[PDB]
Structures are given as structure tokens and as C-alpha cells.
Amino acid sequence: GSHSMRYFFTSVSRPGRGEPRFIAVGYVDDTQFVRFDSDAASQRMEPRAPWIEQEGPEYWDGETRKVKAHSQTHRVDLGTLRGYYNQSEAGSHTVQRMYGCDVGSDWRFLRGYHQYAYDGKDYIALKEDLRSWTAADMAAQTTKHKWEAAHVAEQLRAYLEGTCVEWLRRYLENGKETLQRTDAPKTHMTHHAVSDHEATLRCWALSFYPAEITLTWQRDGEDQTQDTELVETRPAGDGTFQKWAAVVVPSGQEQRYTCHVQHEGLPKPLTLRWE
Amino acid sequence: NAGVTQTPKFQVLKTGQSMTLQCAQDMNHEYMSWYRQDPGMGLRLIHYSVGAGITDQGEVPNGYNVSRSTTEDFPLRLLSAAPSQTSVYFCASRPGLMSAQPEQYFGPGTRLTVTEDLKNVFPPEVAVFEPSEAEISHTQKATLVCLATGFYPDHVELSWWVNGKEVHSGVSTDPQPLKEQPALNDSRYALSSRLRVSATFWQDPRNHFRCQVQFYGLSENDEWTQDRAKPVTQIVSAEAWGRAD
Amino acid sequence: KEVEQNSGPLSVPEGAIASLNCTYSDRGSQSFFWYRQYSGKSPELIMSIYSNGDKEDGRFTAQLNKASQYVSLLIRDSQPSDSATYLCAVTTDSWGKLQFGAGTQVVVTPDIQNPDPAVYQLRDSKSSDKSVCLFTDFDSQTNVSQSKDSDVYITDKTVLDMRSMDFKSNSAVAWSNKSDFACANAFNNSIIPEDTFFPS
């Protein structure tokens, strides 16, 4: 159905240890395709998916330049925000930026975004309409007046509604085998009685793409979430994902507990039962 | 062009002379470039700078020189002038990282002419020609043409002046000066311009017409031990008068 | 040769539409410009376009088609003051070099409602010893050529602008110095129509 292309940027300052660390990563849905790390060998935008290696020398030259420009605004941004909040020169601070665009099942434009963080909390973000800004505080309000005068919103709106979705589509057909695959979960359930009075049923979901999955517990139809451990969805490292979910069950009642699995690679949703 | 300014407007040099073309900019931009413009080559990049302190070369940097100590000024030095540096030069300005506005704005340009030897510099001879013995008695209109002739280099600014005040109100000047003998690179130039008014304004004898040509040549600084009068930056003018027929 | 432009010259009459083509090769280009440059001065920016589709501003309309890599510029209701060479310019980012084309020279020819072509001889009262032949008030189709011998210097077709009526006219000037010649022999190589005035 829907697809997306998102770019992630992290810049962290190194007080008395020189230039900042800068890392840039690009995704199409849940697949990383490009990278830049200020600490890597090459000093260029590097490929991370097979289908992007077929872009020629002008693409990489271009993306190296642009990613270095980003890195430069970030280098200054750390000094600017340090000034903005009157912080000392002795501490390490972090800037995060994420932009990107969503398309529908028809591949036409759906949504565009550009948000910005300072020390792990909101700073400024482009509003839904791509014309306006939300400033997080009195400092951030200064950035907002500056970005009105700089016409940032206008150039972002041209990118997000145009170039972001033009390039996503190029990527989506170049990596037909990879990006338009949908991988059904492999499911099984385990039983581990930790004591003589209680038992732990653990539903598993393994080998799935994309990462969006929903695992729920239930006793005889009604949605039990009271006695429930659910881990964060984690990467297997091969491109697919993993997730488990558990219940602490008063033992002998394991038959009237059901586990519900929702994923877009599954036609009908799955129920699971132990016996 | 309220932002990007450049000095000078026009320049003659001989082979091996040094000069610097000043370029300034008003709009707090980071990204400045030097371009040269030539008939067969289009616009070509000389040197460029994406921030204060730093500069880098373009496609044609050989024989040119560049620095950027401040964000406002981007001067281009020519150290030893060569006859192949004869061109129009454009300062250009772009915001870079301080704004998202993509647009690059240009300076008004410096016309530079590098010659083999300084004896080639000649001021123009200006002559105004009075409208025809037929034209007034055929079209009810009167065309004064002007000739500016025998000048090198093509560094001129023509203007017509009736009764003391400058007119633009009925003039076609030639867009470009043409060569007198198109076979030489020492060759001198000619430029023509026409001023049209009615019969009841040419025939009025109070009316004083004047074609005015500003020449840009040598300064009172260059060495000059020649037979000729010294071809400095000067104005040569000619005049015609109101005449009843 | 990254930016390919319309060769030139383009000739449109006044009130018409001049359409200009531009083709670029870097697929990742993002910002697109049209510059206007009159002869003897600086390129002046008139149109920027940032995204696919049409953008209108007064008499200018510019399209962009990134799929087939194409910029256009249309000039509705053409003035004679649009006579310039027009540059297509293309960039990728804040730091990218601007990629210019060669330019297309656009010539806007004025309306003459009814012409009569005429060749006139001029003098003055100076010490300057030459005759000047003024070929004027003629058809906008008519050309001017300047390669006969190494003596007679012929200029180009220039358009004057009288702001009394609307009376714009074409003009050309030919002369020589230390040789006697008539005004019905300097434009002898150029094709002039059947009703041209020669000094009675």
C-alpha cells in the first residue's frame, strides 16, 4: 500500500575534541539505502541497498555535496543554539533533523514533513500544510522568524510535494524485488512454566517485512492486556523483523487464551492457541 | 543589482600589467563567483567562494587570482595581463546556507581589453549629420544621425542632448560597436546612433542638438612619449543646430 | 554540455508569442531559472521555477517537466523591448554550480501599419568629409548585408521609438571615407522592394 522516503540526520558536538560527529541515513520504508558518517573512510554518500548502486557518478557527487551542506548547517547550528540558550562551551549537545514524504497506494503525494530536535526534544517542525511552522519555545521562535525570511517552507514544499515523491517512485521501481516485497511472519508459540502455580505463554512473530506488526493477547474473546509483556520490534539483521509478546497465566487455563497477529503480508489475521 | 556591485565599468591594459576588479555584495550572501563571458564560449566560471576565508577554482582559473577575507567583498586579481583575457567579467552572488532562496544575482560587469601595445588606444571622432533634403519634405520627420569613429577599445557610452537635457525619447543607438577593418585585433571601432523628431522642432532655431560620446581609455598616470595627443578617458561631442528651410 | 538551449536567432513580431526551449541532463536538478540579457549588459533574472507544472508572472509563463527534463519560457504580448538573448539556468542545491545554456537571441520586430522604404543622403557643416546613406521607414521582413569590398561599412537594422504617435521605424546606416559613391549603390547587394525612394 503506502510507501515513504525518510532522511535522518544526527549531529553531536565534541567540546574540546574538535569537529562534530555527523551521521546521515536515508530510508525507503524500512530499508536503509544511503549513508554518510563523518567518521567513515570515504567522506561520501555511500550506497546501502543493491538497487541504488545503479545510480551514476553524478548522483553520488550530488548527494555528497548536499549531505556536506547539511553537515555544515548543523555544525553552525550547534554553536548557534549554544548561544541561544546561553550554554557553556564544556558540554556535548545533539541536533536531530528528520524530513520525508508519504505516498498512497496510487503512488501520488499523501503527506510531507520536516522536524527538528535539540537535545532529544522538539524544536521546530513544519506544519501539515507545508506553509507554517510550530516553534517549541522562545528561542525556537527566533529560528522561525529567520526561516520565514529565508523562505525555507516554500523550498521544502517544492521538494516534499515534487522531488521527494519523484525520487521515491524511481526508487520503488528500481528495487521492485526488495521494496515491493511483503514478507509474511513465521509464527509459533512457546510454553515456559517458571513456577508450580503459574505459566508463561509467549507468542512469536519472526521473518517479516515491513516492521509494522500488531500482537495482542486475549482470554476467551475479550482483549487481555493486564498481565502482558510486549518487546520492541527488533531487526533480525537480514532485512526482516522480529517481535514477541507474552502473558502470565494462572496455569491450567492455557486453552482459553488466544494470540492475534496483524500484518499486511497476511491475507486474513492469525489466531494462535496452545494445547 | 541593488545587491551586487562591481568596479570598474571599463578597463584597458597592456600585456603584463596588473589590476584588480572589485566586487561587493549587500545581501549577506555566502556564495560568490567570478564569470567571464565570451562570444563562442558563453558564460565560463573563473573562481568561486562558498564562505568567508575560503575559495576554489572553476573551469578557467589560469592567470587569475582570488581571495575572500570578508563576506562582502570578492576581488579578482589579474597579475600579468595577457591578450586572451580580453572579455566581459561578471561578479555573481548566491545565498548558500543563510537562506533557502535558490536564485543567483549578477553584478553589472567589467569590460576589459588587453592589447599588445598601448599606442593602439584611440579616442573617437564624433560628427552629427543633419536630416535630409528629402525626408522633411516627404515624411514630416527629421532624423539626426551621429557617427563615432576610429576608437579603440569599444568602451563607449552614447547619449543625445537637446537644449541641455538628455533625451532617450526618440533614439536608436547601435547595440554594439562594429570593426572598421575586420581582419586585425589592433582594429578600431565605429558606432552609429539616430535621433528622430518632428518638422516643428528641428526647424526651430532655438533648438540645440548634441550627440555625446564618453570614451574610456588611459589615465593621467600611464607613461606617454608619443607624437599623438594622449588618449585619456574623455568625452568627445559634436553638434548640429536648428535650421529653417 | 549539460544545458542545451534553442540555437537562435528567434524572430517574432510585436504582440506574438515567443516560445523558448531548454533541455538539461542532470536528473537530480531542483531549481530552474530564466535570465534576460540585453546586449552590452548583465544577465537579469526574470523567472524562477521550483516544481513541476506552470508558473505565470505577468507576460512570462514558464513550464517545467522534470520527467522529460525540459524548461520552457513563453512571452505573451511581445514588446520590442524584449529584444534580448535569454539564458536558461539550472542548479541542484545551495552549493551546486549554476549550469547555464548558450542562450537564444530573441528579436522582436515592430508593427508598421503601412511602410514606404526610403534612402536618404545626409551632410552637415563640419570639416568631416564623408556622406552618410540612411535607409529607413521600411518593411520588417527586409534584411541588411555587409560584405562587399573593404571600403563601405554598413550597419544593422535598428528600431527607433517615437512616443508621439506609435511611429516606430527600422533604420540602417552605410558610409565610406575617401572614395566617391552614391546611395543607390551601397545597398545594391541587399534585396530592396519595388517602391524605394531614391533622391528624386
Partner: peptide, 9 residues
Amino acid sequence: LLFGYPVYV
């Protein structure tokens, strides 16, 4: 493809 016009805060 990356955004081409990043601006200082």
C-alpha cells in the same frame, strides 16, 4: 534524493 536548501537555525 536530499533536500537542496538547508538553512541555519
